[model samples]
Target: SMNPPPPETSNPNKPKRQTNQLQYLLRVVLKTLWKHQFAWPFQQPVDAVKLNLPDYYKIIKTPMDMGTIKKRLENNYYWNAQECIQDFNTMFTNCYIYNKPGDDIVLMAEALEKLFLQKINELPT
Candidate 1:
């Protein structure tokens, strides 16, 4: 006689059900992005000191990385899919702001962002 916990009753927002679905979607999307070739530059945090970019921190105040995003997902830091996607956008936006056009890293970020956007578009409403 084992029974699962009862569902939350009559909440207008009803985020619990939607959260579960978005979490699964994010997991799948992340796996797909990680396997992409252009994901190399974004696979981990950018090391300013090691990379000789002393001013990197000054420009990109809110630095987001793939590893950090995945960790945030695992820890339930995002309340909605849009918030999680916003972080991804932040990561690419930082790349654009800091790197010059035609740079390899910038190109990688461009391709990755395109892939990410395409995945999000494919998600069912």
Candidate 2:
């Protein structure tokens, strides 16, 4: 008679399970951060509870002249303006999944505009 075959076992060295656990932990941390930073009581006039995808995209895509923006961020490095803009565009386009229009979108936009203006004002005289 032939000997019975050995049962299959999970690989210990591959560590797929460990990787998945880490990924889950990272997601939980990010969710918590988002809740605290942007999702909680938005503290602005516009209700954050109603922002739509288009509004979110518009906010994230608010224009920054790439040449000027890159120069500012890369004050100490040799920065490629096109590459910087492309990178920011890609990240903004993919990072969030907007479900519905939030009420706070306008306020957020206003805040961003004000901040941008402040940055502009701080540029070397």
Candidate 3:
């Protein structure tokens, strides 16, 4: 059964808490990514509205532990760092394709641009 998301609070202070939580989550994810070298090829600069995430939670706090990532790495086709990164990229692309409804607006425009972009190379004979 589908359930509605929690309604937005009318408190002006709520956004700060949400931002902190989001930052904490992203920190965990970033640590997990760096642990297994799954970071994307292009890294975004930390200059844009950068705020330091609290150092309270470490890599272990991520949704998936490093051991699971290592297992996936070991079980993949190529057992190398680059290969693992490729696997992550492929996984993310698959996720995007599955979730996006061909609208192409709220998708991974930067990383998966090629998935939605195509240029004709030749004219029909």
Candidate 4:
């Protein structure tokens, strides 16, 4: 039987396959952080009280509060710079869809606004 041809080499100037794999893994970590941040509101009712608000306000504000939670996680927990960059890349490339303008845009807009605002809030005033 004839010998198999050697595999072609990837471009050295571009990111290596392993580097891209690591970037993807880190992006998953950030995404997981995003999920947990949003889930915290439902996970603990008492902690919800710690948030500044009256009961009616809490009812009206819970979803928006979740936005702040997501922001905090992205700002504080997702501190690895590589992961942050990759997470944003993933969001813009994959999550920024326009088909369901009614709900998807509103949700994504809230999330993105919170993410940027959290970064600003973390900086020294």
Candidate 5:
């Protein structure tokens, strides 16, 4: 035994796998999305991502202003993740008895992003 295979990722859902083409492409897509600062559950220092944003505000992008959900994208397909998140909040609040939907939504968004990342990582290159 000399070398070993590289580490990979997993998903909590444990759905059946798919083709190498799709999965690998998804991984690449996630990387690009993260870089472009697009994609929900936007990557950040976990603890800080939630705390600093706290459902509003974000890291500096170009020093002109912070990258807030309010200005993430143009008006199309509910492009605004911030508003889409808010749209989910009210319904979720009732489901969870209004305890804390904000963080819950954020976590779910993170989960969604992670699932895609998992797809990207799994399967052969």
Candidate 6:
């Protein structure tokens, strides 16, 4: 006699579950960034008028900061892990574009960027 096939109970959408885990890991990385001493410069938005850097707005198109990224996480704006890393890169790129290579702010941004890459690589995803 021929045996019948077993009933299927596997979840087809199981892979989607990893997104939540990624979100949790993202928060951990953000917290570590906030704790860093060089975080002060990138913690908040740059006030062009107050800082007297009028060209800042012109050069930096999509201004990003730690606070904005945190809010994005809270509002679920980041749909994927790649977007989170992309935003961090955008922030660093903006700093490099606006500041001289040897400037203290630029150097701080470099350190933060290195830390970000190190932390992201530590995640399983």
If the candidates were sorted by their TM-score against the true structure, best first, what order would they fall in? 1, 6, 4, 3, 2, 5
* TM-score computed on alpha carbons, candidate 2: 0.25
Candidate 2 per-residue lDDT, tens place, 1-125, comes to 12122212223344232233223222332233233433332222222235423354345433322233233332322122333334333332323333233536334433433443443344332
Which one wins by lDDT: 1 or 2? 1
lDDT of 5 at 74: 17
Q: Encode model 5's per-residue lDDT on 5-67: one tens digit a residue.
A: 221222344444444443333345334444543344333222334344342212221111112
Candidate 5 shows a clash count of: 1
State the displacement of the C-alpha of residue 12, model 4, in Å, after optimal TM-score superposition. Answer: 21
Q: What are the Cα lDDT values of the candidates?
A: 0.74, 0.32, 0.31, 0.37, 0.34, 0.73
**Candidate 4 residues 1-125, lDDT tens each?**
12122222223344323343234333443344346434343222223235433442323321223333334343343334454444344333322332245665346545654664454344322
lDDT, model 2, position 84:
34
How does residue 96 of candidate 6 score in lDDT? Answer: 93
Q: In model 2, state the lDDT of residue 3.
A: 17
Q: What is the C-alpha RMSD of each candidate to the true structure, in Å?
A: 10.9, 18.3, 18.9, 17.5, 16.6, 15.5
Displacement of residue 20 (Cα, Å) in model 5 is 9.4
Query: TM-scores, in order shown?
Result: 0.79, 0.25, 0.26, 0.27, 0.23, 0.79
9-66: candidate 3 lDDT, tens digit per residue: 2334322222332332234432444433333321321111233423312211212222
Over the full model, what C-alpha lDDT does candidate 3 score relative to the true structure?
Answer: 0.31
